[model samples]
Target chain A: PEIITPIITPFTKDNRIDKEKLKIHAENLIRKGIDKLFVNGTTGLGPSLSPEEKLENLKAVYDVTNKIIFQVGGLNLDDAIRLAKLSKDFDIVGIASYAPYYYPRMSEKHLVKYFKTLCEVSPHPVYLYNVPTATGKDIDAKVAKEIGCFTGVKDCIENIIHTLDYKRLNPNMLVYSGSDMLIATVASTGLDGNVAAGSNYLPEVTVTIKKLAMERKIDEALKLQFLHDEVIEASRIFGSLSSNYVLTKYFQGYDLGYPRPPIFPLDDEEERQLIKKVEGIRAKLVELKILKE
Target chain B: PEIITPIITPFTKDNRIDKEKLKIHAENLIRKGIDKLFVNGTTGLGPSLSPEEKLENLKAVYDVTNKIIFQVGGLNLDDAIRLAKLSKDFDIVGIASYAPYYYPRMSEKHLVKYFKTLCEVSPHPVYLYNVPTATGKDIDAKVAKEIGCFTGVKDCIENIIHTLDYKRLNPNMLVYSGSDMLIATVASTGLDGNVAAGSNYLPEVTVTIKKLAMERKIDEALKLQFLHDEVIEASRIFGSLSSNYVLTKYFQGYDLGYPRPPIFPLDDEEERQLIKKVEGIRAKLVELKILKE
Candidate 1:
């Protein structure tokens, strides 16, 4: 169950989530070799979603995918406690809170306290996530290692994604390469493989890259990881989610068919162009011997 | 239709407007002789609102009191159109996209286009609002007249608000004076009439001021206007519908049991203070022979 996957947020036609479909969607993603499922990430359309919707969506992922790792994103202090209290039933294996967007940027100390609050109330062990490229605020290496030293937080640090540059190679850190484009470059740091959304669609390719990275096969890892980078770019043509999450529903055509309006999906012409991009990337991967056609 | 009435927005606990309540509430406000209703304007809480919500809410106002004049107070040309289209049922009133707390300072041409587009597709002639007080952007007289000459515009001016000292008042500009504090001062400037949202609760007082102002009875106009001002201030103690619409919802809820949270009805102590203010204003209206005892 180590294959980290992002859970699909199942929304109804009226744009409200179809609650049962959420559970069903999680099971579907899990069966697709998705080791662990994270609910309410940017890819899951968490920004527009309410806290209660997040909890309902999280419960579905946890309960349906019984043994699969269940992680919920967007854990604000209050939300983290509420979701954590609810997580007691399923025994959430790991808890992580990426930087809270929309809120004002927190200073290093304030951010440390923010994560500490999440870890304190969470019934399970906690991990720190720092995807500054998305949130505009990056947790510094000194502060991250400082957070890793906190008594309640240290041992459970599932992944320190912020340290992808230099600190990632630290033997003590379970650092993950969260950025899809940085998968190849970050893997050179000898950390855990890439953890992101689109990786769910191309498991064989992701596994190949991870295997190459683990075997100290830098050349092979770089080659396969480029395919990972290509797929992410390939998906860009479909009115890319671009941190604008609602598009995730339409791009993947998951349980949430179309994104809610004001977040209009790729127009028909855009969709045609996107499908071509996907096909082109697949062709390139096979040609490069990264994946067998 | 001289009394500028404020409209109340009905939001769910999660802040989604309950359209049913919004329409019903508007009907109640219009029944009280509110000449014009302002929607999504400063007092209307525009920033946090989505475009579709603004359109839907304005349409609710348009439908409820078909006779009520409508003014949509949101910036962003895209959102302005959504609300502007609601003018189809009646002679829609015009308002400019001015700066608010959330929006940063924009260019003058951007402001010009903002007003020009408002004039376009507007069934009713639109006015260019230049309240430099709330929004940091101050629309000058020359630009106001230039934009007033836009193809479909009706009036080139708004309430003579925020600044009275400027010598450049446009002749084509029909400056409707705003608020109790500035009413008499603004009236002295030869404005069309006062466009005070506080008058929504006291239409008789507002209309009487216009009659008195036309005849140069400054003493009489000021006395009656004070009552309207006091009522507006009283409702605002807890929170006025923001721009002045809070009075509409305040009195509405006052007649009903209680208002929703974040904006609860005045507490006992605050209510007593409101009672003193309402009674004092009622006495002044009676003394001025404007309203009955």
Candidate 2:
């Protein structure tokens, strides 16, 4: 029941990638007893990033933690491959790539070819990501099985059906659940880890849930899982993913600035509401004994 | 009445940038009398391209045409700026960038600041592109007026309201419509140009429509506009923007490989329907005497 947090790329007030802030953020998460870091995934806005910008992001956190996965996916194959080669110098343990998301959808054959090439070239263990909501192509279990090169998959498909089905066929292949709320159920089925997005803020919550599940404390794990859902739902009032970045920074007592455009910071009214909700969340987490008051 | 086309980026079979094919395509558009080339805009998928790849695109068509606008917008500010500097070496007319599309929405102040920096730094004359459908943020009239450094705006606001409104506010701002159906209407209102997507295939259609409108032949231009809409409506059966890439290549008798994923080439059935519709389009153009049989 390993728990990994997809680290958010902290930006400066002027919209520059704030490497110092990222390093600080990464250190804070690791200090809180998080398992690993997933750098440059959706939470990090990897799809929109330039290779150089993404590399800078990886560099900031690469030395901060040893257990990290670099997401090197992009629209340009050449750049994606370059990122793979560049990561060879880093201290990361694994490399991951989402199916190319620039198109409306890529053909299954095209996806297979792309994944195989990247996996074959990767120096580290490779993970294929199936996030159709973000990438627009759901890597079916059938095709996922045929992409023999990948050692695991980080799937965000809305249900547990694909996760179980993936493990069914590719018995040895690792499966990491991307569903934030289903961490307990995923761990019950023995998932390799939970690459949960909100874990950026709730490392304690996720790490504890995983710990409880590993210890066979199913009843205790559900209690925290319920709390996790409640907080996530309240945070939604700020805005979806964009608000989370600001909220994470605010709670951590840092001003890492807003998300890059066309993603923006919460408006004034939304921000006011979010501040109220986050304060309540902080207290609730403290009361639940997930975090110290 | 300037008819500018946001040309598609032609990929080689290996999905690498096809520089040679790009030159040929640019020459073809020039030969058919397209007014200007909007290189690497939405149709070209600029948002997803690396700076190096976009430079290759500019270099590929730089000498092929003098009337060109390099679309230098992307998620990475540094990369976008690098592209802007790179375009200085080329004989292009201007540089255009859309508001950053990654965030779903951005504040007006940030949008103005972003455009102002680019326009101020860019070596070539700068234009702001407002394709809300793609970027999710529209450059409002107030913001557009304030970012007066821009010489023009290539807008795809889904209607003529913004196009006309932009003109009304910024008297010096040249308005270019992204509407395919409103070419005649756009021309009649004295827009500086048309950046219609389908001009990649219907160069003769748009060029002639502009000519007719300029000569005050309203009825004749309207007739061609109707025909243009019919042909374009039929072409969409093939696919969205990605399908249009294939349709353009097919009609031009060249094999410019598939679009980058999650945008895809037309599937087999859609391709079949497109071929039939294209033949009908070719014949209709011939009947309208726009293209010589």
Candidate 3:
């Protein structure tokens, strides 16, 4: 039932990190039994934030939970290393980094060296985040095993074979699914857990589905999984991941601010439509006795 | 016959920007009659560099040529704005920015606003860099026209119609092809010029192809164009754009340090094989009266 949420960072009207709202959101998620967290991840807009701003975000989340994985990967190695070093001060669980975004075709040797340097800098364990859609580079399984420094991988590659390859090559390395849609499928395979964005808005649904899958009640877990897909499809009607901030705001009844510029906030009309669709999914969960309300 | 070299930024052994090598590279390109230049572009690894390092690169190139377009776009708008403001001090020709990389699905309205905000801050004419391969977002021709702030576009979308649409939609706006392979094809369309990485090592080849295309000598242009493709293929054996640094160092006989990390430097064996293949092409070019010995 372990559902690791890549938490969303809220901003104030002036476009600064609204730490109070962030702390409140983190506390709420922890209270809902989703204790493990991934901070400054893709869902958290890690690339869009400044290193100092990311540090501030980490500090805010650290206050709410000691179980945190801070993503330090970026275009600059120096900055990534600096952020990794700063993360140690928080005494969080561990750190994660994705492949370089701009240079997608970097060789396995260079990718290994890049992650190795990060591992050398951090005192805690390092986790490689493999999300090719965002980073433009897919980390090969052999490359992952060869790196030899990573304690685990948050594999969002979305292929069952690729996800299993990480664990097959390195049995000791923990493997977590980053795809929110694959919670039941991955859980059925006996992977570690999920670092899904869905847990940001629907922790109960994700946790329930994972628990069902773990208990070998896949028929029930799959029923919930299909329903969860409807939730994801509805949220993404406006924009990918940006809509999560809107849904989080509506569900939590607090201002999570907007997903920074270039990713415009959904307008009132769009939000109204999305909420109506999401409400239908929530009602189904409640009727199935999956939700208290 | 204009060829805008999206000049390469070299790094020292410790990964610091080699300003002296940068200055020399710029001077060499200018001396070869490729006066117009683009600094801090994808070829220059703009995203990987710190704002201070970018400023240093701009300054180094500025000392050699005033006909430069400094790219100020990045994941962070604040950094882009600050760089655009700093560019005003240089009295350079203009500045350019590509669409946001991380959030590729941004709406046209937000894209317009993003470019508009950048235009408001820049004193020089702003150019839109439309390289979807690198940025993950294609700036639509209609969207390009709507932005209304771009004085020109460095269109690398590779479609002839897309390149022409920018100019057809706004006759006043200049359109330059970013693809090195498309110089002759784009030139035949009477587009503005090219912002090619190949020009860093083979300015003579790119400049000549454009001149031939301008002269309605499509037959001759295509000959060199095909040959030029061979050169590009040879250089890219190690990696895209990263290989240019190796070729430039070979051609110019000065250590134009390796590309920043994540983009590994080609080894001596790789370089030896690459140089042998490239030397064959140079001999062919000289024989054809395209390149001077």
Candidate 4:
């Protein structure tokens, strides 16, 4: 089993991509034992950013680690292709991308063509990102299998059935669970691993859940998994899917700036509420002696 | 009843904005008797364009018409406001913008803040664009009332109930129908006329549908509307929400370039099927003596 953290891009106080801080953040996550890093993903607000900013941020983090997957998806295909071409010169192992968010029900043929086009320029194998809630489109497991060139998928859709079916058809394809809640399940079912935002803050816990399940210590892993679920649930009280951003920055003791508009940062009161939630969960983890501090 | 056609932006053979072709397209729509032009809205592929491209396109069309509503929405708030501020120098009546489309379910409060901020910079009134099928977010009438600082709404939620509901709260607020099929219904209900893409191909028929509905000529209006629905439906065979692009460029006897990536142009088969569908509708309308060419 492997652990990949969909790393957050730390932003400056002025809301620009803070390359220095991003370098520091990436180094810290890799030192903390993250198996791999995924940059400019949902956690980093990829679609909301310009391709130039994304590339600069990617280079900053790329300087820090060789085992990273650059998310090259965006509304602009030219930009995505440009970013993908640029990544070929980098040390990364794979590129991850999601469906174009708008244009409500895009044709299956067009979507296949979209992925095929991306694959043509990619030097590394491509990883599929299927976060329908954000992208307004999903790369179904069957469709992913049909697309043919993809090496793996970060399956975000919550249904385990799709993951199971995906593995049935593509025995060697890497399938990373997108949801933290499914980390143990995916590992137990012999899927590749997990890529989750929660891993940014709880890297050890996320990996532990998968490792324990893979070793057949399901009962013990399930206990730790519930604690992991608690932190995520509490953070949700303040930040929706952005809870990962809030918690990651909170633990790092720095301002990661705000999520680009539409997805806002927690206000003062909400920030306090988030602190309370994380602290509450931290205290519980301490009591369980999962943390020495 | 003011008839507004969400105007299409023309592009050259090489896919750059064709300023001359755009001016010609706008002039033709105005000559065909479209009451007002809603430039840079969905029909114009406003969301898919760069801020610079959008502003340049705006200026190109702005040279031809003053009674226009410029759609200034993009992925960036800064760009939206910059365009809105620039519009102050133009003679346009208002700005129409949809919610920031990337975030899945953007908080209602943040969305309201987005529109309010855009409204702050525009000297002209603002029109809310609530096309959930495209933008993945809709400003409900209740939410719109709570936001409180909009001139009107252009809703394409496919339910007339939302349009009627929006009007109930803000009785004076203009509600432009986003769907051509609802043109007669909106006009009959005292809602405003539509901002449809089909008007690019069938301007005279689009206007006649509304006038007939306003005069309570239900049977005659319904017949025309059915024909209108056929053109819209056939165009869908080629373009998704972009059928207007297919029909408009097809009839205008030039290429309008393709919509930006993820949303695409029709293939050879789809193009032929689109011609068949449009011709089928055109033959019926011509036999009825409603169209000469």
Highest DockQ, which number?
4
Instruction: Kindly give the stretch of ten consecutive residues in candidate 3 chain B with the minimal lDDT sum.
Output: B102-111
Name the lDDT value of residue A217 in candidate 2. 96
Q: Candidate 1 iRMS, in Å?
A: 11.4
Each candidate: how many clashes? 3, 12, 0, 0
Q: Which rank order by TM-score, best down to worst? A: 4, 3, 2, 1
lDDT of 4 by residue, B61-127 (tens): 8788888888888766777877888877887888888887756545566677788888777889999
Model 3 residue B210 distance off true place after TM-score fit, in angstroms: 1.6
Compared with the true structure, all predictions reach lDDT values of: 0.53, 0.77, 0.83, 0.77
Task: Give the TM-score between model 1's chain B and the true chain B.
Answer: 0.71
Evaluate residue B290 in candidate 2 and report its C-alpha lDDT on the 0 to 100 scale.
79
Task: Encode model 2's per-residue lDDT on A1-293: one tens digit a residue.
Answer: 67888888877777778898888888988988878898888778776666788899888897698788888987777677778988887777788888765344345656777888887778888888787655545786678888887788888886888887888888888888886788887887777878887788778888888788878999989988987887677665544566677667655665556676545566777777777766877887788777776
Q: Each candidate's DockQ score against the native complex?
A: 0.04, 0.16, 0.46, 0.51
Can you tell me the DockQ of model 3? 0.46
Comparing candidate 1 with candidate 2, which one achieves the higher DockQ?
2
Order the candidate numbers by lDDT, best to worst.
3, 4, 2, 1
* Most accurate candidate by lDDT: 3
Candidate 1 ranges beyond 4 A from true positions? A1-3, A18-32, A66-76, A105-108, A148-171, A242-256, A283-293, B1-293
Q: Write the per-residue lDDT of candidate 3 for residues A11-123, one digit (tens) a residue.
A: 77667889999999999899877958899987887888888988998899989889898888887787888999887667787998888886545656667888999999897
Model 4, position A195, has a per-residue lDDT of 84
Between the candidate structures 1 and 4, which one is better when assessed by TM-score? 4
Q: How far off is each candidate at the interface, as Cα RMSD in Å?
A: 11.4, 4.9, 2.3, 2.8
Model 2: share of real contacts kept: 0.13
lDDT at residue A75 of model 4 (Cα atoms): 61
Model 3: runs farther than 4 Å from truth?
A: A284-293, B286-293
Model 3's CAPRI class is acceptable
lDDT of each residue in B233-283, candidate 1, tens digit only = 576554454223334433444332232222333445655656666776666
